[PDB]
């Protein structure tokens, strides 16, 4: 599913991501824009053999099981395919565990490089939230 900008904002809010760990809803929408261009079916293979999955490009080395990342863990206790669903629940619950891990949203490279420090409130402008 390719979400609209305000549509994704509303879904993230209902699922409790807004202001989670102090990160406003605009931060989460901006991260999704630059990680996946709002496409739940996005995938990206990394040089180490791990793969990134879904709207927030969550990685198989630590967070989900895909059966093809040797030595990896599955700390969200889910198949990586669950992160590709039109329903964003699995992606949201796993993101909550990642952003509590120690480095905050710096865990998302696209967030650090393209959202951090910017006018992120622009991502939710106009939305009936
Ligand atoms: Cl915001
Ligand atoms: Cl790829
Ligand atoms: Cl594996
Ligand atoms: Cl959720
Ligand atoms: Cl933080
Ligand atoms: N939720
Ligand atoms: N949730
Ligand atoms: Na894994
Ligand atoms: Pt939902
Ligand atoms: Pt939820
Ligand atoms: Pt729901």
Nearest to 103 by CA among 23, 46, 42, 9: 23
Residue that the structure tokens 């630059």 belong to: 34
Residue that the structure tokens 């206790």 belong to: 77
Ligand 7 proximity of 13 Cβ (cutoff 6 Å) = no
Q: Transcribe 9-62 into DSSP letters.
A: HHHHHHTT-TTBTTB-HHHHHHHHHHHHTTBTT-EEE-TTS-EEETTTTEETTT
| C-alpha dihedral (57, 107, 10, 3), degrees to nearest 10 | -20
Binding residues for substrate: 101
Q: Are 94 and 78 spatial neighbours (Cβ–Cβ below 8 Å)?
A: yes
Is residue 52 flagged as an active site residue? yes
**Cα angle: 114, vertex 103, 69; to 5 degrees:** 90
Give the tokens for residue 85. 């669903």
Ligand 7 proximity of 15 Cβ (cutoff 6 Å) = yes
**Cα angle: 10, vertex 78, 16; to 5 degrees:** 25
Q: What is the spatial distance between Cα 41 and Cα 70, in angstroms, rounded to a whole number? A: 23
Find the 86 Cα to ligand 2 centroid distance in Å.
20
Q: Are 115 and 34 spatial neighbours (Cβ–Cβ below 8 Å)?
A: yes
Q: Per this entry, what is the length of the chain?
A: 129
Method: X-ray
Task: Specify the CATH number for the domain of residue 92.
Answer: 1.10.530.10
Ligand 7 proximity of 16 Cβ (cutoff 6 Å) = yes
State the residue range of the domain holding 119: 1-129
Residue 129 carries which DSSP code? -
**Structure resolution, Å:** 1.0
Domain count, the chain: 1
Own/partner pairs, 32-35, CB within 8 angstroms, 24+ separation: 32/3, 32/8, 32/56, 33/5, 33/123, 34/110, 34/111, 34/114, 34/115, 35/108, 35/110, 35/111
Strands (E), 49-127: 51-53, 58-59
Q: Looking at the CA of 11, name the nearest ligand.
A: 9
């Amino acid at each position: 599913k390719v979400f609209g900008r305000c549509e994704l904002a509303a879904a993230m809010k209902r699922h409790g991501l807004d202001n989670y760990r102090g990160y406003s809803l605009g931060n989460w929408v901006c991260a999704a824009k630059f990680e996946s261009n709002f496409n739940t079916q996005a995938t990206n293979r990394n040089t180490d053999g791990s793969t990134d999955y879904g709207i927030l490009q969550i990685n198989s080395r630590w967070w989900c099981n895909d059966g093809r990342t040797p030595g990896s863990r599955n700390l969200c206790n889910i198949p990586c395919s669950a992160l590709l669903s039109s329903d964003i629940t699995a992606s949201v619950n796993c993101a909550k565990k990642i952003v509590s891990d120690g480095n905050g949203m710096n865990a998302w490279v696209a967030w650090r490089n393209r959202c951090k420090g910017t006018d992120v409130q622009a991502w939710i402008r106009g939305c009936r939230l």
